């Protein structure tokens, strides 16, 4: 039986700017680095950056909707978004759903998100206003 997400691994084209982005800009804790990768944590999340020459710096119009959302409190959301904006981090989508969300790109074009709110909160909102064809289990 699977008990949760063990780790998220992102392929990166250049290790140093990716470490700077996740550790310094996004505030994650750097635990180890080697010639071809790094391990960071963000709360319970174990993040691995893996140096991969096959990683392309990918414009957001050229990748699908797969994305990684990090939790932040409502109280901290606006100042963190402003930090990303000051750093010139590109946005790939505007928020149109429930709960605050900021959609931003990493140096290689990985699609990231800041989101406020849990699955339970989303399901409660959906019960009141179900999406087209929505069924609950």
Ligand X SMILES: COc1cccc(C(=O)N2CCCC2)c1
Q: Give residues in contact with ligand X (CB under 6 A).
A: 16, 33, 135
For the record, the structure tokens of 102 come out as 């900021």
Q: How far is CA 45 from CA 19, 36, 54, 55, 85, in A?
A: 16, 20, 25, 22, 24
CA 60 to chain CA mean position, Å: 14
- Is 113 annotated as ligand-binding? yes
User: In this chain, which of 11, 69, 100, 125 binds Mn ion, going by CB under 5 A?
Assistant: 69
User: Which residue from 39, 37, 8 is spatially nearest to 110, judged by alpha carbons?
Assistant: 8
Of 5, 25, 132, which Cα lies nearest the Cα of 68? 5
Nearer to Mn ion by Cβ, of 24 and 118: the residue is 118
Interaction residues for its own copies, span 8-27 (CB under 8 A): 8-11, 26-27
Q: Give, as one character, the DSSP assignment of residue 89.
A: P
Asked if 30 touches Mn ion (CB under 5 A), the answer is no
Nearer Cβ to ligand X, position 15 or 116? 15
Residue 102 marked ligand-binding: no
Helix (H, G, I), strand (E, B) or coil at 127: helix
In the annotated binding site, the residues are 7, 67, 113
In the annotated binding site for Mn(2+), the residues are 7, 67, 113
Residues contributing to the site for its own copies (CB under 8 A): 1-11, 26-28, 30-37, 39, 41-46, 50, 52, 54-56, 63-73, 76, 80, 110, 113-115, 117-119, 122-123, 126, 130-137
């Amino acid at each position: 039986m699977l008990s949760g997400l063990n780790h998220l691994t992102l392929a990166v084209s250049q290790l140093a700017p990716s470490v700077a982005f996740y550790q310094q800009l996004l505030g994650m804790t750097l635990h180890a680095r080697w010639d071809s990768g790094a391990y960071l944590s963000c709360g319970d999340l174990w993040l691995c950056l893996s140096l991969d020459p096959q990683r392309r710096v990918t414009p957001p119009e050229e990748s699908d909707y797969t994305h990684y959302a990090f939790s932040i409190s409502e109280a901290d959301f606006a100042s963190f978004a402003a930090r990303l904006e000051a750093a010139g981090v590109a946005v790939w989508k505007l928020n149109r759903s429930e709960g605050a969300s900021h959609y931003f790109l990493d140096p290689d074009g990985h699609k990231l998100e800041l989101h406020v709110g849990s699955l339970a909160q989303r399901l409660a909102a959906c019960r009141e206003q179900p999406y087209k064809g929505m069924v609950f289990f």
